[PDB]
Amino acid sequence: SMTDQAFVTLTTNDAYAKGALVLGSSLKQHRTTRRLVVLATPQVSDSMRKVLETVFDEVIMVDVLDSGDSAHLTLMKRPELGVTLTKLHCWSLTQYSKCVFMDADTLVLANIDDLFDREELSAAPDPGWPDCFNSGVFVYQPSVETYNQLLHLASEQGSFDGGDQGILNTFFSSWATTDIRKHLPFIYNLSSISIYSYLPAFKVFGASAKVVHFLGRVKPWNYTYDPKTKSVKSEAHDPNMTHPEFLILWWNIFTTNVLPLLQ
Amino acid sequence: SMTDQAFVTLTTNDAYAKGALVLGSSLKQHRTTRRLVVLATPQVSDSMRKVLETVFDEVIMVDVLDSGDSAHLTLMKRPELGVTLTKLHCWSLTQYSKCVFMDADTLVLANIDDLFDREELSAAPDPGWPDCFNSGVFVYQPSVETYNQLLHLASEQGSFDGGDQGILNTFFSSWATTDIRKHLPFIYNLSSISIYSYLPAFKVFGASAKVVHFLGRVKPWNYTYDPKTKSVKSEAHDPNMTHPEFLILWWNIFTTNVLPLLQ
Numbered sequence: 001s002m003t004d005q006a007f008v009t010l011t012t013n014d015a016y017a018k019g020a021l022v023l024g025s026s027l028k029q030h031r032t033t034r035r036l037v038v039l040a041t042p043q044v045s046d047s048m049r050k051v052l053e054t055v056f057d058e059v060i061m062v063d064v065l066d067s068g069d070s071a072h073l074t075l076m077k078r079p080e081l082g083v084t085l086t087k088l089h090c091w092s093l094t095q096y097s098k099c100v101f102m103d104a105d106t107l108v109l110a111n112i113d114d115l116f117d118r119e120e121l122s123a124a125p126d127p128g129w130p131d132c133f134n135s136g137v138f139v140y141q142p143s144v145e146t147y148n149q150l151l152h153l154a155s156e157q158g159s160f161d162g163g164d165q166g167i168l169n170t171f172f173s174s175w176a177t178t179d180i181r182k183h184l185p186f187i188y189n190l191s192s193i194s195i196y197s198y199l200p201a202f203k204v205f206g207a208s209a210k211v212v213h214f215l216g217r218v219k220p221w222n223y224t225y226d227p228k229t230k231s232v233k234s235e236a237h238d239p240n241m242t243h244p245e246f247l248i249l250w251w252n253i254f255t256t257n258v259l260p261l262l263q
Numbered sequence: 264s265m266t267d268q269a270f271v272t273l274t275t276n277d278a279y280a281k282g283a284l285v286l287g288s289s290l291k292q293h294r295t296t297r298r299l300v301v302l303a304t305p306q307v308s309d310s311m312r313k314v315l316e317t318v319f320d321e322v323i324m325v326d327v328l329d330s331g332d333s334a335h336l337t338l339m340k341r342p343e344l345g346v347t348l349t350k351l352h353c354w355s356l357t358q359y360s361k362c363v364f365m366d367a368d369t370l371v372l373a374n375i376d377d378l379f380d381r382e383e384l385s386a387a388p389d390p391g392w393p394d395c396f397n398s399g400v401f402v403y404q405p406s407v408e409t410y411n412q413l414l415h416l417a418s419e420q421g422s423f424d425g426g427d428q429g430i431l432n433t434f435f436s437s438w439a440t441t442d443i444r445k446h447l448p449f450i451y452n453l454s455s456i457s458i459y460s461y462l463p464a465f466k467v468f469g470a471s472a473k474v475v476h477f478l479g480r481v482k483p484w485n486y487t488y489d490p491k492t493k494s495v496k497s498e499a500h501d502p503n504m505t506h507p508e509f510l511i512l513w514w515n516i517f518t519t520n521v522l523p524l525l526q
């Protein structure tokens with residue numbers, strides 16, 4: 001645990017870095033005994049790298065990997081997600097025997113160190129197509145073999161969604177049909193889309209939520225937050241505002257724990 | 264071939280009966296060798312019951328069971344779905360050893376008799392909360408024991424969503440974590456919402472779809488269809504129109520196979 005296992009996140013810029021900082025802070029809040037690592041690319045400013053170094057045990061600099069797959073990315077109206085191929089570098093971290101990758105738009109609500117009981121590749125179902133796993137939280141084993149296989153697949157075939165999730169689902173294609181232990185409970189990767197879409201289920205199961213995932217184009221750091229009243233401005237049709245306490249928690253952690261580190 | 268196995272659907276009115284008729288027509292189109300059964304309630308007109316007897320091998324009259332659960336039904340803005348507890352009568356059908364229940368708003372695209380290789384309770388994940396199964400397609404074993412247990416649970420505790428899906432998930436609570444063979448592939452219950460929500464997945468996995476499920480308040484029979492050009496009128500934000508060929512298939516089956524028996 002102490003030395004050989006890690007939580008790993010990714011940021012390619014200073015905007016998603018705010019997410020990584022909140023994520024990291026939340027993992028510390030719930031007393032993880034594992035290492036905290038962030039993959040960062042050159043667009044992350046030197047000053048932001050130094051702040052990341054105050055929350056994460058290590059900031060590892062990597063090259064951007066970009067699908068350039070405009071056709072598939074436009075299908076999802078997420079033209080900016082080609083750089084998510086950069087996530088594949090997480091397999092290069094052979095200093096660790098086992099890691100949990102978490103998207104920089106996640107937030108931890110409870111200690112989730114029991115994820116290290118799982119084996120590669122363990123992930124939660126994606127609400128959009130639930131025979132695919134969501135690649136925002138997953139348990140994997142760093143490996144030079146797997147790393148290079150994934151790079152090769154990405155170069156030769158690309159990804160069916162132009163980002164990491166398509167290629168990871170294609171590589172780890174047995175997930176839907178083999179080994180139910182590699183299905184993480186949905187409470188380890190609770191997309192705000194699910195709360196909005198089937199509120200009765202959230203009402204009975206949502207109290208057990210361990211990780212919330214602010215999946216979608218609008219991210220927590222794109223809201224206007226008032227720390228005096230603890231509210232955000234919001235617009236119509238916003239699944240983040242079905243149970244807005246997760247978004248306010250994000251902002252509370254940012255305002256109280258991250259904002260002083262930005263001084 | 265199995266004279267002791269059946270597909271089973273439900274209609275409490277003449278509107279959903281149009282759905283049942285198209286479903287049963289589609290099961291015949293794809294050469295099922297099993298029996299076709301429809302549970303119908305007193306609000307189904309006598310003329311419609313007679314038409315149902317042309318498609319279905321058995322039309323079984325049952326009493327409406329209604330949750331009356333306005334609080335939970337309004338959370339999903341589906342105030343009409345309390346009558347879905349009537350589905351529980353499917354477990355009374357002890358003349359069959361095994362059955363597949365299918366919602367009246369489903370449509371079969373390929374032979375699915377291989378579902379009878381599955382054991383109770385086998386179902387596909389729900390896109391809204393994917394640690395719940397969707398109760399629109401499920402493999403079950405009729406049983407007086409199970410029937411009465413479900414009725415009793417429904418009377419004492421009700422359903423967390425006011426309809427059958429909540430209570431069925433509560434009763435068959437091991438589904439998410441036990442026996443991956445009881446996870447039907449999502450292609451056996453493909454919700455239109457999923458096509459709309461993660462189109463790249465539909466583009467690579469969707470050609471294999473076996474069953475489409477027109478889940479949501481607007482049903483196929485509510486569209487205005489022009490048989491001359493094979494088109495429907497549609498409004499903004501319609502997940503059914505992402506891949507509208509499923510809706511058009513519904514209408515082509517209705518127009519050619521079913522409408523002439525009604526009008």
Ligand SMILES: *[C@H]1O[C@H](CO)[C@@H](O[C@H]2O[C@H](CO)[C@@H](O[C@H]3O[C@H](CO)[C@@H](O[C@H]4O[C@H](CO)[C@@H](O[C@H]5O[C@H](CO)[C@@H](O[C@H]6O[C@H](CO)[C@@H](O)[C@H](O)[C@H]6O)[C@H](O)[C@H]5O)[C@H](O)[C@H]4O)[C@H](O)[C@H]3O)[C@H](O)[C@H]2O)[C@H](O)[C@H]1O
Nearest residue numbers: 076078084128135136163164165193216217237460461500
């Ligand atoms: C829909 O059509 C209109 C939009 O075209 C819509 O109007 C909307 O306007 C708002 C947009 O500004 C919208 O906010 C919503 O934002 C999300 C849309 O971005 C929406 O969630 C939906 O869209 C997401 C995509 O962002 C779908 O996720 C799917 O695709 C993701 C990648 O694009 C997957 O992420 C995964 O893959 C990454 C890349 O490989 C990987 O790096 C990640 O780690 C991994 O998570 C995801 O898995 C996959 O499912 C959602 O499925 C889909 O629900 C939110 O609901 C919402 O916040 C408003 O909702 C809306 O008003 C109009 O209303 C609709 O008819």
Ligand SMILES: *[C@H]1O[C@H](CO)[C@@H](O[C@H]2O[C@H](CO)[C@@H](O[C@H]3O[C@H](CO)[C@@H](O[C@H]4O[C@H](CO)[C@@H](O[C@H]5O[C@H](CO)[C@@H](O[C@H]6O[C@H](CO)[C@@H](O)[C@H](O)[C@H]6O)[C@H](O)[C@H]5O)[C@H](O)[C@H]4O)[C@H](O)[C@H]3O)[C@H](O)[C@H]2O)[C@H](O)[C@H]1O
Nearest residue numbers: 197198237339341347391398399426427428479480500502
């Ligand atoms: C959201 O806010 C606005 C909604 O008011 C929305 O504006 C919309 O207006 C249109 C409405 O005409 C909308 O069309 C929509 O149609 C679908 C629903 O009507 C919607 O899908 C969403 O809603 C359904 C609810 O019907 C969710 O399903 C969940 O709940 C179901 C039961 O209610 C579950 O069904 C299951 O359970 C039954 C009862 O127990 C059982 O009998 C069944 O057999 C079984 O299937 C289901 O499993 C569960 O998931 C969906 O999850 C959810 O996606 C479409 O997305 C939507 O298109 C227009 O799109 C929109 O303009 C506004 O845009 C949004 O921000």
Ligand SMILES: O=c1ccn([C@@H]2O[C@H](COP(=O)(O)OP(=O)(O)O)[C@@H](O)[C@H]2O)c(=O)[nH]1
Nearest residue numbers: 010011012013016084103104105136215216
């Ligand atoms: O410009 C970007 C886009 C994405 N990411 C990283 O890739 C992940 C996946 O992207 P995102 O969460 O936006 O996808 P979603 O979950 O919304 O589909 C993020 O959480 C970040 O870790 C990044 O660093 N920079």
Ligand SMILES: O=c1ccn([C@@H]2O[C@H](COP(=O)(O)OP(=O)(O)O)[C@@H](O)[C@H]2O)c(=O)[nH]1
Nearest residue numbers: 273274275276279347366367368478479480
């Ligand atoms: O007024 C109704 C409502 C529902 N149903 C039956 O219950 C199923 C579940 O309801 P629906 O499909 O509308 O729910 P959804 O799948 O849209 O959540 C239907 O397919 C029908 O078989 C019915 O017979 N009459």
Ligand SMILES: [Mn+2]
Nearest residue numbers: 103105136215
């Ligand atoms: Mn994300």
Ligand SMILES: [Mn+2]
Nearest residue numbers: 366368399478
């Ligand atoms: Mn249905």
